[PDB]
Amino acid sequence: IVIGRVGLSFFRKRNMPVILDITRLPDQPSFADIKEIARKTVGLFADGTFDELYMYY
Amino acid sequence: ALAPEIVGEEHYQVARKVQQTLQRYKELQDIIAILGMDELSDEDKLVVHRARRIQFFLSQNFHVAEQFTGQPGSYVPVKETVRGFKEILEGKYDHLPEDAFRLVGRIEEVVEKAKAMGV
Amino acid sequence: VAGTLRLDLAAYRELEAFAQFGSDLDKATQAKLARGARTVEVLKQDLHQPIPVEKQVLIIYALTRGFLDDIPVEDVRRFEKEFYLFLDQNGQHLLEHIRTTKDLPNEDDLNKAIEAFKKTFVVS
Amino acid sequence: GKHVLVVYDDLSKQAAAYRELSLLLRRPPGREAYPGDIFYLHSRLLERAAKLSDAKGGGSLTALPFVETQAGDISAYIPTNVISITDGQIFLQSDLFFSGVRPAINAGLSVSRVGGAAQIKAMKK
Amino acid sequence: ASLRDIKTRINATKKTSQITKAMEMVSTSKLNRAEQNAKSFVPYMEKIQEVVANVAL
Amino acid sequence: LDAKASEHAARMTAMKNATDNANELIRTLTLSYNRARQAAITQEITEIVAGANAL
Numbered sequence: 001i002v003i004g005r006v007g008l009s010f011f012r013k014r015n016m017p018v019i020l021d022i023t024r025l026p027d028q029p030s031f032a033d034i035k036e037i038a039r040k041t042v043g044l045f046a047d048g049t050f051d052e053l054y055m056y057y
Numbered sequence: 058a059l060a061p062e063i064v065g066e067e068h069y070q071v072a073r074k075v076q077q078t079l080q081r082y083k084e085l086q087d088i089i090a091i092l093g094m095d096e097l098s099d100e101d102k103l104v105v106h107r108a109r110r111i112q113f114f115l116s117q118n119f120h121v122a123e124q125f126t127g128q129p130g131s132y133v134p135v136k137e138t139v140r141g142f143k144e145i146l147e148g149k150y151d152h153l154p155e156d157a158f159r160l161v162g163r164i165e166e167v168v169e170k171a172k173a174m175g176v
Numbered sequence: 177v178a179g180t181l182r183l184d185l186a187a188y189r190e191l192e193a194f195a196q197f198g199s200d201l202d203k204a205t206q207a208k209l210a211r212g213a214r215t216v217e218v219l220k221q222d223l224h225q226p227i228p229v230e231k232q233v234l235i236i237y238a239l240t241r242g243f244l245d246d247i248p249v250e251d252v253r254r255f256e257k258e259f260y261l262f263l264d265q266n267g268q269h270l271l272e273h274i275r276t277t278k279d280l281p282n283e284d285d286l287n288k289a290i291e292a293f294k295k296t297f298v299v300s
Numbered sequence: 301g302k303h304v305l306v307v308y309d310d311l312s313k314q315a316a317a318y319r320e321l322s323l324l325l326r327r328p329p330g331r332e333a334y335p336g337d338i339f340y341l342h343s344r345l346l347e348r349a350a351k352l353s354d355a356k357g358g359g360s361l362t363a364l365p366f367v368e369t370q371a372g373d374i375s376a377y378i379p380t381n382v383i384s385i386t387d388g389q390i391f392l393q394s395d396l397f398f399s400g401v402r403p404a405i406n407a408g409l410s411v412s413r414v415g416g417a418a419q420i421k422a423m424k425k
Numbered sequence: 426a427s428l429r430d431i432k433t434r435i436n437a438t439k440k441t442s443q444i445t446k447a448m449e450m451v452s453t454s455k456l457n458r459a460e461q462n463a464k465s466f467v468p469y470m471e472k473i474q475e476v477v478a479n480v481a482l
Numbered sequence: 483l484d485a486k487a488s489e490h491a492a493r494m495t496a497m498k499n500a501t502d503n504a505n506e507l508i509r510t511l512t513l514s515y516n517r518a519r520q521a522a523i524t525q526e527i528t529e530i531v532a533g534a535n536a537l
Contacts, residue, residue, distance in 0.1 A: 027455055028462050029486065057485040087437035088444055098196040124416035127424070193443040197451050328536035331529070428522070431515040435508060442504035449497035456490035463483040 001041055003034075068135075071143050075111060078146070082108035110145055113158035114167070131162030140164070152176075177233065180240040181215065188212020214244050217252035230274040231260055234267075237280070243290050251300050262293040301357040306349070307364045311342060315378055332377060339381050346385050374409065388412040 001020040002008050011018050022037050045053060061069040081104050085097070094102070120130030141164035144150065150167065157171035187208050198206045218239050221227070235256055238244060247255055263271060267289050270281045280286070315338060322335040330336050342365075349363040367382050372393060374383075383389055388411050396404040416424055426434075 027486070027490075028458055057488075084440070087440050090437075091441045092444065098199060101196070124414075127416070193447040194451075197447060202451055203454065326536075328533050329529070330533070333529070333532070426514070426518070428515065428518055431511060431518065435511050435515065438504050438508050438511065442501055442508065445497045445501040445504060449494055449501060452490050452494040452497060456487065456494055459483070459487040459490050463487055466483055 116160045118160045177236045213249045230271050301359045304361040311365050
């Protein structure tokens with residue numbers, strides 16, 4: 001799961017399995033800006049799609 | 058002879074606007090070559106987009122240059138060229154590829170060339 | 177009025193590189209950019225049409241006192257032309273005062289005349 | 301009535317030689333110490349290559365003058381003098397040469413003033 | 426290099442320098458705003474951390 | 483939020499470095515321009531005088 005079009009382009013050029021992205025975020029984002037993406041990410045853990053979360057920043 | 062009372066107000070305004078756009082485009086090249094096109098504002102991006110098409114549309118195929126171009130030349134009346142440049146400035150042809158504007162003549166020839174190119 | 181005009185123009189020239197970043201309203205210096213743009217519009221002039229010194233003084237006074245701050249920069253030339261016509265019609269006392277004493281008229285009278293013209297000007 | 305090909309392997313070297321002769325003969329110099337008629341020298345030489353008419357026998361002479369530039373400066377005095385005379389030029393660049401493209405012809409700066417008429421019909425097409 | 430070429434390079438570099446200086450100052454203001462925005466988030470994070478530590482353990 | 487702060491700080495530092503490098507380049511280019519200007523003036527004046535006293 002990638003936040004940012006530069007990382008999106010990186011992974012697309014290296015042909016990697018990206019499933020989610022936001023690609024457009026304000027300079028001073030609020031919680032409502034990433035509420036949906038965070039909700040989907042945490043839901044995918046309980047959904048059984050994958051059993052581990054690592055995050056890099 | 059480029060005065061409002063000689064060529065007409067519309068001709069004068071179109072010519073001055075074309076010159077202003079090209080002059081603005083000249084200044085943008087220095088910073089484009091360093092920082093890329095992505096860092097420009099939306100107004101500067103539109104300026105570049107229209108200036109490239111204007112510069113290509115200033116080209117023409119001459120009758121005496123068949124030995125160099127491979128195609129017959131064209132003759133363009135001043136009313137036609139004024140109207141074509143006015144339409145380009147207004148943005149009627151922003152969706153056309155910029156290579157379709159090279160060495161054509163009238164503005165309808167740009168549309169025909171782009172149609173042949175498959176747009 | 178010339179000192180204020182020069183200060184505004186110099187401040188604009190110093191901040192010209194920030195014009196692209198004012199599009200998202202990054203800070204409150206954008207008033208200087210707007211004033212400089214209007215100053216540049218005011219200083220333009222056509223061929224073989226010199227302006228009398230009293231009219232030049234009045235238009236520069238209007239610019240530097242903020243009366244053009246709500247006129248779009250695309251309308252400043254037409255504003256100046258219509259203002260000169262309005263002056264010829266109604267501000268003859270102000271023009272005569274400037275011509276005779278070489279000094280500005282009363283500030284209140286100038287403000288009243290400018291506002292009277294401004295409520296009749298129509299923004300394009 | 302024959303056809304001739306002539307190659308001058310360096311015109312800049314006779315330009316230097318003519319400058320040397322002119323200075324030794326006490327003729328006052330001009331730009332870059334070159335004599336006044338440095339253009340006339342090369343124009344007089346190169347105007348004698350031509351394609352004769354049918355009444356003159358139809359023979360031809362064609363010329364390939366050479367000019368060596370310094371650091372790729374095509375806008376120097378002698379290079380511009382020679383360019384203003386001939387019917388086109390082929391410009392070779394070191395940066396193209398090392399980037400892998402050989403014979404390294406710069407298409408933007410090269411031109412032929414006879415182009416098209418000097419080609420087979422198929423090649424023209 | 427000729428005088429014209431050197432003069433063109435000088436002017437281009439001056440324009441680039443002005444643009445970069447403006448970008449630096451804009452980024453400085455944005456960094457200040459981002460720091461205060463991050464500061465405004467601390468109490469909620471502290472509260473939820475304390476609640477989770479109390480309950481889940 | 484941490485990432486956004488890091489990004490803004492990184493942009494500020496990078497643009498500061500770019501501005502400093504551009505200023506240094508401007509200085510060196512101006513020095514070379516002045517040398518070329520002086521050399522030119524010397525060359526034309528020498529050629530003029532050589533032609534003049536060649537007569």
